[PDB]
Design a protein around this nucleic acid. Sequence first.
RNA 1: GCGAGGGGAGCCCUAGCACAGGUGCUGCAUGGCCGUCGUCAGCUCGUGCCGUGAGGUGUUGGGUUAAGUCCCGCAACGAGCGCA
Length: 117
Amino acid sequence: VKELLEAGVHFGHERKRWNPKFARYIYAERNGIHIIDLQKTMEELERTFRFIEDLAMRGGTILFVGTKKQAQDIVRMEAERAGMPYVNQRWLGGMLTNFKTISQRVHRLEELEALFA
RNA sequence: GCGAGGGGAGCCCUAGCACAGGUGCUGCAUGGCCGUCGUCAGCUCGUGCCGUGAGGUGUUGGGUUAAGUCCCGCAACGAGCGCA
Ligand SMILES: [Mg+2]
Ligand SMILES: [Mg+2]
Ligand SMILES: [Mg+2]
Ligand SMILES: [Mg+2]
Ligand SMILES: [Mg+2]
Ligand SMILES: [Mg+2]
Ligand SMILES: [Mg+2]
Ligand SMILES: [Mg+2]
Ligand SMILES: [Mg+2]
Ligand SMILES: [Mg+2]
Ligand SMILES: [Mg+2]
Ligand SMILES: [Mg+2]
């Protein structure tokens, strides 16, 4: 059922902005718009969720992210409904890399709850 | 020591030694203090990111303000010397 749902209404959309690499992942390009390969997508989904199966059970944490409007809300509920980290708003430069200083802002957060109750 | 006479401290003259004192230089040897641009809106540090590097980014941009004042946006995130 996971396969036919995708085939339903969740594939192909972009046009005239394609990379040479995303081309081999393509199935066709009629009406002037690209059409992603559903078959290869499944196989990739398999390999991905395999990494998910390990990652989830390893106890590790996934950092979700999406600034696109169509994904801000979707990833929002789905990240909380899993307790996993995520950022829908404008991603900051250094969040992962310069993490030490980004955390200082998280520390400024607890200060708020202090003078909030 | 009853008296004579002797030495020391305080203080002086004369002779002699070490030394004092100098509004005599050098404000390009300096401390300190002061004028000045100008109360003008500025100048930087920490880490991250870009560049081979000098360095950039932040502090640029849009609105606003006496002001780097505040807001929104932002590969940047905070802080410090200033403004208040
Ligand atoms: Mg469905
Ligand atoms: Mg063409
Ligand atoms: Mg941002
Ligand atoms: Mg005598
Ligand atoms: Mg002399
Ligand atoms: Mg001088
Ligand atoms: Mg001087
Ligand atoms: Mg002179
Ligand atoms: Mg480098
Ligand atoms: Mg080179
Ligand atoms: Mg620099
Ligand atoms: Mg600069």
